[PDB]
Amino acid sequence: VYAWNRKRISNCVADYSVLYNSASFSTFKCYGVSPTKLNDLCFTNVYADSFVIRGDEVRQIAPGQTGNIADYNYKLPDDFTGCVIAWNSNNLDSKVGGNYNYLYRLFRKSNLKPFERDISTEIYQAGSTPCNGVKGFNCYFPLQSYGFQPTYGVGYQPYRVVVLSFELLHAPATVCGPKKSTNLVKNKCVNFNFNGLTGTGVLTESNKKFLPFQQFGRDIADTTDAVRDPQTLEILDITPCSFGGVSV
Amino acid sequence: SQCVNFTTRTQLPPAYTNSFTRGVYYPDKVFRSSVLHSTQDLFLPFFSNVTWFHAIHVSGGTKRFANPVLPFNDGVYFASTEKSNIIRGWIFGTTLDSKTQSLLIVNNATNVVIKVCEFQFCNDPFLGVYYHKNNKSWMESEFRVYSSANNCTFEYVSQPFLFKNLREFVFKNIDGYFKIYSKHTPINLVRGLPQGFSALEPLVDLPIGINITRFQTLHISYLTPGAGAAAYYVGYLQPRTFLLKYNENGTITDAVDCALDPLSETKCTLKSFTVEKGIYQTSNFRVQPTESIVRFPNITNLCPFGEVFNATRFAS
Amino acid sequence: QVQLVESGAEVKKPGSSVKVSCKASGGNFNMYTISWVRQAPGRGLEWMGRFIPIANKANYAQNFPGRVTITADKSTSTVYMELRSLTSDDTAVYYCARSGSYDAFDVWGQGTMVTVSS
Amino acid sequence: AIRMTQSPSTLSASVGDRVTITCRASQTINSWLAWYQQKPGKAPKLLIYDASNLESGVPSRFSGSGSGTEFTLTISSLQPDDFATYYCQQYESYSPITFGQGTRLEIK
Ligand SMILES: *[C@@H]1O[C@H](CO)[C@@H](O)[C@H](O)[C@H]1NC(C)=O
Ligand SMILES: *[C@@H]1O[C@H](CO)[C@@H](O)[C@H](O)[C@H]1NC(C)=O
Ligand SMILES: *[C@@H]1O[C@H](CO)[C@@H](O)[C@H](O)[C@H]1NC(C)=O
Ligand SMILES: *[C@@H]1O[C@H](CO)[C@@H](O)[C@H](O)[C@H]1NC(C)=O
Ligand SMILES: *[C@@H]1O[C@H](CO)[C@@H](O)[C@H](O)[C@H]1NC(C)=O
Ligand SMILES: *[C@@H]1O[C@H](CO)[C@@H](O)[C@H](O)[C@H]1NC(C)=O
């Protein structure tokens, strides 16, 4: 938790529904965005901060929280925009003799700024007398182990916490959700949506010889006349659905 | 890798030529057919003096001829005339050091590598190949371009790729997108930028989102136990309105630069490549101002704002 | 380069007790746990106990109830493993292993040959 | 106490061949398993950790696989220097840690 791993995610499609319905996540607290809407949004960057935290301190991974974790190990900003996922991994981070590989910072001069990693192991001086790198009276090692065991309490078991931080800017949008595939319908008046371009018309097979770099074709008056299906690289002519004055 | 240091460094003097009617590229991905369409974009103006320099790929003979660093401005038209693929890649950035993010594009023997990182480029980037006599084929064995590379942001690898050939490329950095256009032609000319027309098809657009002000080319070096050096040309793009002609199959077959000459102004006004005999009101002449002159009263008193914003008591 | 140096060879009699050392040189002693592994001749490795500097705790193998008592001096970064009630079957090389980073014994001591006989 | 069983206990092979060593656990130890190599007269050195990774400095010819209860150490190209006794650790329960019975590799 004091050395939480941060991974930057970009240039890919993120299927948040698949991860949502993947395992038994004891906590899926999304602040600033509903989870079900995660597939309908494009994010500039996705930061995956992964660490291990005991059960009682899981609640401390949230904006506006106070405590040893939220002040010395991992601080979430008050303007946090993203999800926090946590699942009880008692079958992987708990050992009979005690798993001491996970350490949490216990003593620090000041509370951590949001999204700050401090992996300094210098002895903390709690008294007037200097420590000079030697731990003793009024001199404490900042990091303390957890010591997870399978027989520990439910609130003392290790939870593997992954905090997804979406950089909600949408200008250099590179992480998006999955893409819908509604079956193409031809020779019928339909409301088509190709690559975000919306319109209404009748789609027919076309003999136009598109060049490979070209996506759609316009008329003399710059009205969309043909498109290319992003799924199947084929060219479809778009004709307006028939209209005309009704005279009696 | 580790940089290779050359005691002697030299650069050939620049030369100048005319761009003729090249540098025209598909402004968008919209198919069009048998239509004359006007587009205002960053184009290379026709007949626009373009600098060019020779790239030496063989030494014969202890002088290192290093390519120079040229400004990027709003976009560059880079042309290369060569027999074998001498020109291999480019480096773009502002400071070209680890202080700022820098882009490096290269097409080695294996594939195309595009990396945006805080590269620390060497003084003389080196790409060396040696002739394998047993295999009777040249194989690259030296790659010394950057001493260090840290904090990468974007990575791209295109399709793995290995009587002269002219390769034209356009590099345009707009809205955090680094758009590249390419065109490859067989050219029979020996020297000079060829005169003709050929539209440049887009190759890839990269949302690197960095600032570019300078760039430098990289050449290949043929290591030999111990004359036909390739040439390359550079022009700078400007905001211009061009009238492009799309034929039936949808490729730009011709283009009219306007604000080049009055005839070209007539052509785009008429939205035609052919103009009939007559007098056509094309544009408007206006004499732009030369100097600006401010003439305010010669008053040096300071207004008593400190007696109104610092009053001890403000009235009811 | 973390190097672990143990004590010299020890010769004892049955019914006595032995106490070997493991000087941890380099790195941070307060994070990595020191584990003692013994190997009788003609037999595979056997685990004895673990010292946990971060928690200031000592663990012993289930097969050795109260026979092993592990203490250490954090000032000098020296780990001492005490084995009690030596018998003829305890003649083995008592390595000390540093289960660092990934809980695996990446660094092993030179090993001391402890011989228990009349 | 988790018991570790190796197979084969004694194996012989020539230089450059393929060697497969199976160390099967008694309980589900996930992926926590380490492979060692103990040349006679020398302290064992780590080769594989987490049952799939390769320790720094170990030649790339060593490869490990398997998870759950059965694990496997495989040498792509056996070398004369790679003839020693290989053990498997089960660092999933620290009370007590059980090594393998020992797989001695001999020149065929
Ligand atoms: C998408 O997958 C379909 C198979 O259902 C394939 O026919 C089509 O060409 C694919 N489109 C791509 C790879 O752009
Ligand atoms: C080309 O432009 C350069 C300045 O960049 C100028 O010195 C040279 O005379 C020009 N030559 C021609 C042919 O216009
Ligand atoms: C790395 O580059 C990115 C730009 O993509 C910048 O935002 C970040 O501050 C840089 N950090 C480092 C490690 O220099
Ligand atoms: C268009 O392309 C087709 C097939 O590639 C070819 O048969 C036809 O002649 C081309 N027409 C023009 C005007 O280029
Ligand atoms: C050229 O075009 C003019 C129209 O301006 C026409 O009068 C003349 O006959 C044309 N000449 C030829 C040779 O086409
Ligand atoms: C009012 O007084 C303060 C302090 O002397 C000064 O900083 C400020 O500029 C004054 N306000 C104006 C409007 O001059």
* CATH homologous superfamily annotation of chain C: Immunoglobulins
Second-tier CATH architecture of chain C: Sandwich
Text of the CATH class of chain D: Mainly Beta
Taking the alpha carbons of the first and last residues of chain D, their distance comes to 36 Å
Percentage beta strand of chain C: over 45%
Using the coordinates above, name the CATH class of chain C.
Mainly Beta
Percent of residues of chain C in helical segments?
under 10%
Tell me the number of structural domains of chain C. 1
Instruction: Kindly report the name of the CATH homologous superfamily of chain D.
Output: Immunoglobulins
Q: Number of helical runs of chain C?
A: 0
- Sketch the topology of chain D as an H/E string, one letter per element: EEEEEEEEEEE
Overall tally of structural domains of chain D: 1
What class would the helix/strand composition of chain C place it in? mainly beta
Strand content of chain D: 35-45%
Largest sheet of chain D: 4 strands, antiparallel
Oligomerization state of this entry? part of a larger assembly
Could you give the distance between the termini of chain C? 40 Å
Describe the main β-sheet of chain C briefly. 7 strands, mixed
**Topology-level CATH name of chain C:** Immunoglobulin-like
Task: Describe what you observe in this structure.
This is part of a larger assembly, with 2 copies of chain A, 1 copy of chain C (118 residues) and 1 copy of chain D (108 residues). Chain A is mainly β. In chain A, 4% of the residues lie in helices and 31% in strands. Chain A has 2 helices and 16 strands. Chain A has helices at residues 16-20, 68-73; strands spanning 5-9, 12-13, 27-31, 46-54, 82-88, 103-105, 124-125, 139-140, 143-145, 158-166, 175-176, 189-194, 197-205, 216-218, 224-228, 235-239. A 5-stranded antiparallel beta sheet of chain A has the order 1-4-10-5-3, with no helix packed on it. In chain A, strands 12-13-16-15-14 form a 5-stranded antiparallel beta sheet, with no helix packed on it. In chain A, a hairpin with a 2-residue loop joins strand 12 and strand 13 (197-205). The longest helix of chain A has 6 residues, at 68-73. Chain A is elongated, with a radius of gyration of 28 Å. By secondary structure, chain C is mostly beta strands. Chain C has one domain (3-116): Immunoglobulins (Immunoglobulin-like, Sandwich). Chain C contains no helices and 11 strands. Chain C has strands spanning 3-6, 10-12, 18-25, 33-39, 45-52, 57-60, 68-73, 78-83, 92-100, 104-108, 112-116. In chain C, strands 2, 4, 5, 6, 9, 10 and 11 form a 7-stranded mixed beta sheet that branches. A 4-stranded antiparallel beta sheet of chain C has the order 1-3-8-7, with no helix packed on it. Chain D starts with a strand and ends with a strand. Chain D has a 4-stranded antiparallel beta sheet, with no helix packed on it. A 4-stranded antiparallel beta sheet of chain D has the order 6-5-4-10, with no helix packed on it. Chain D has strands at residues 4-7, 10-13, 19-25, 34-37, 45-49, 53-54, 62-67, 70-75, 85-86, 88-89, 103-107. Chain D has one domain (4-107): Immunoglobulins (Immunoglobulin-like, Sandwich). The chains are: A mainly beta (248), C mainly beta (118), D mainly beta (108). Chains in contact: A-B, A-C, A-D, C-D. The interface between C and D is medium-sized, with 24 and 26 residues. The complex binds 2-acetamido-2-deoxy-beta-D-glucopyranose (NAG) (6 copies). Chain A: Residues 1-192 are annotated as: Receptor-binding domain (RBD). Chain A: Residues 106-141, 170-192 are annotated as: Disordered. Chain A: Residues 99-107 are annotated as: Immunodominant HLA epitope recognized by the CD8+. Chain A: Disulfide bonds join 30-83, 42-176, 131-139, 189-241. Chain A: Residues 88-159 are annotated as: Receptor-binding motif.
